Design a protein around this ligand. Structure first.
Ligand SMILES: O=C(O)c1cc([N+](=O)[O-])ccc1O
Ligand SMILES: O=C(O)c1cc([N+](=O)[O-])ccc1O
Ligand SMILES: [Mn+2]
Ligand SMILES: [Mn+2]
Lengths: 422, 421
């Protein structure tokens, strides 16, 4: 009844705490690889507010933080999940025209909006359910089941390859899936990231390909043969340039050919060339005999990675090029099974706070990697839901009013779902 | 055909097979220190031109992945075995004689090769390493690639409480990591010890830490007696009562959740693997708490939370205050779309062994093996090897049997890798 109203009033009074928590958290430097400090904040925040957190991680400076709001007994568990890492590092001048742009690294309340990529993704939705949990506890809401509060590291799609290995470059393998596999299990799970108040419970897989084109023989610049046809060039960089336009057209058709509609959303799987190199910049007097490209290829839940690899091998084959197409990352995407209880609990809350039925999610938010996948993979029916446009968009701010709305929806969802008997 | 040629090659590789298993089995490599074994296999693969790569989370605990590349257009088959062994010389806490011999060494006697390190799992590993060599030296025609995968951390060690990170990790940095970072293929054969009996279902597991509470703490000259066990201020005493209740629950668990699948019969068992409270060097006050650590195997269709509730209920029935906390959960799977590999292996087996395959023993279907990650990731996978399981514990292989296995592995590959995906 009004045990909802009681909590809602409480949250209305926590607006200033909602802001500060988001800003203090968003202000912390925490790109993937250095989320340690961000975790420490969240651990101690949970600690002060009595959620009894544990650090659950593979490395001592890169870990997940898990706390709980324990219930009276006999109810279903709900996890809330957001990630501690952010996209931009001040380091990476190789990816951004202005790696040191204020919006990439800081977070502030102007207006009544909160700006910062670190807030959109993801500190942000995290602040929303942290506050939401605080409300439930202090309003003394009746919950039979546990609320699991899971702040994870390494959600962002950084992966090791070649000589870039270990602690510095790992992400998802030590993130959510690790936390869940080591205790953070629950009946259902809500991943709080930015959709536009549109729930999604399908997500994409991905396979990463390293395509290395071979050529040669190496020649000192005064001996290079000219003129020669591009595809016959001894310079592997030259050949690769030709392979790139062939691959871009293949990609244009890929996303359309493998578009697929699920109940949880329409998956539009896209392809991008994310990195190139060959050979080394500090020794350029001989062109390279080889040159590599690095491809991000998203998968719908029903696409086998090897199928995609053969398609790419075929593009190369059509050009008459000798190349190695080697996969160095594979993760599966999933659509949730048995999602209705969480779907419904959320739907009820959403119509109360936002006012209309929920809409079908935007394709990009269904066609990415979010941590709904590890939960789903492990039998915890899971969806994603939060305010604002995705940072991949790129949105750069949240409205404070919308964040408050979300925190209300999160709390309401919990009060419904956590009072069911499993 | 091109088969007889391979068989004859294998008949001639008998001493290389022995040498490889023994040199491999001789290396100290309990889970947590599989580095040296990883180094050996890499160099073995390098010598035979399989172009290996090291794929790992740490630079001294890694997986080794190589390929025997095909002409093009066939199905890919992985062969998988693990680099770690069960017993460490350190483990005086689990074995009465931690420094035996069978636990740590490996040697050629009869026409046997002895050593737990050989049964599990250097030897089945040797079997397919040799098989690949035979295939390569005989110039066998294969349309599809053969992927050679030696993984770390297969064995069920897991971090818990204060034991975290590098030293205590196992499965999270092993096979699933290797597969997730490149070692993918169409099908996968995990070579571990069955008795030439294929299995393609495997069990999951949930580990529970159960802590019983009591108190108040008392200096020994003040301890209240007599008191009923369940009322003792000593948490150790209460835990002792709970242990018996849990053993009773365990006896019935395995029968209640027994389940037969197409891939084998799963009988999920329960063991109390560890206990502690409090510390041995401050015993003048009994502990207000005491913990137990439970290994509970799950069939593929059991939700871990269900098991947690069953145990919480056991505690509740005794009037005890306890915390039941899970610290490990992994799912077990039955393979889907296994038929092509099942058939390829069956045909090979009948040719080499002479009779049809028999149904696997329940324990080989009801454990953790690396068929689970492959299946989880959509690569249909079964287990097959020679000899009795180390969990048995068998302590040797017959070399004749090891040779038979390598032949089955080789033939399986020649069939499957020439079918169109
Ligand atoms: O949730 C997101 O929008 C999101 C975006 C990126 N990104 O733009 O790189 C990465 C991870 C994310 O979750
Ligand atoms: O594969 C096995 O038989 C096996 C046995 C043990 N064990 O007996 O402890 C552990 C891991 C294994 O894979
Ligand atoms: Mn995100
Ligand atoms: Mn084994």
């Amino acid at each position: 009844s009004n045990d909802v109203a009681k909590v809602m009033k409480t949250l209305d009074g926590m607006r200033e705490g909602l802001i500060q928590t988001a800003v203090e958290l968003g202000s912390i430097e925490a790109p993937t690889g250095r989320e340690g400090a961000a975790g420490d904040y969240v651990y101690e925040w949970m600690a002060r507010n009595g959620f009894g957190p544990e650090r659950v991680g593979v490395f001592d400076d890169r870990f997940n933080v898990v706390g709980r709001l324990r219930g009276t007994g006999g109810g279903a568990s709900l996890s809330f999940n957001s990630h501690l890492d952010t996209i931009m590092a001040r380091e990476d001048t190789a990816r951004f025209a202005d790696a040191n742009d204020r919006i990439y690294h800081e977070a502030w309340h102007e207006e009544g909006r909160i700006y910062g990529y670190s807030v959109v993704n993801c500190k942000g939705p995290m602040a929303c359910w942290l506050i939401a949990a605080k409300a439930l506890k202090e309003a003394g809401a009746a919950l039979k089941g546990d609320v699991v509060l899971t702040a994870v590291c390494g959600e962002i799609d950084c992966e090791p390859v070649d000589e870039f290995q270990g602690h510095d470059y790992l992400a998802e393998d030590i993130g959510a899936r690790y936390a869940i596999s080591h205790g953070a299990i629950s009946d259902y799970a809500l991943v709080a990231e930015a959709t536009n108040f549109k729930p999604a419970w399908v997500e994409a897989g991905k396979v990463f390909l390293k395509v290395t084109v071979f050529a040669g023989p190496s020649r000192y610049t005064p001996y290079v043969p000219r003129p020669v046809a591009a595809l016959d060039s001894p310079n592997a960089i030259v050949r690769m340039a030709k392979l790139v336009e062939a691959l871009e057209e293949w990609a244009d058709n890929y996303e359309k050919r493998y578009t697929r509609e699920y109940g949880g959303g329409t998956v539009v799987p896209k392809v991008a060339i994310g990195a190139i190199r060959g050979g080394v910049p500090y020794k350029i007097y001989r062109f390279p005999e080889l040159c590599s490209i690095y491809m991000d290829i998203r998968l719908n839940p029903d696409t086998n990675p090897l199928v995609v690899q053969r398609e790419v091998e075929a593009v190369v084959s059509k050009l008459g090029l000798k190349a190695e197409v080697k996969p160095f990352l594979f993760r599966r995407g999933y659509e949730a099974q048995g999602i209705e209880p969480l779907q419904n609990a959320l739907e009820v809350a959403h119509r109360e706070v936002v006012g209309r039925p929920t809409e079908r999610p935007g394709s990009p938010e269904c066609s990415m990697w979010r941590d709904t996948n590890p939960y789903n993979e492990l039998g915890i029916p899971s969806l994603t839901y939060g305010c604002g446009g995705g940072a991949g968009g790129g949105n750069t701010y949240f409205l404070v009013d919308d964040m408050l709305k979300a925190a209300k929806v999160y709390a309401m969802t919990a009060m419904d779902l956590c009072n069911r008997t499993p």
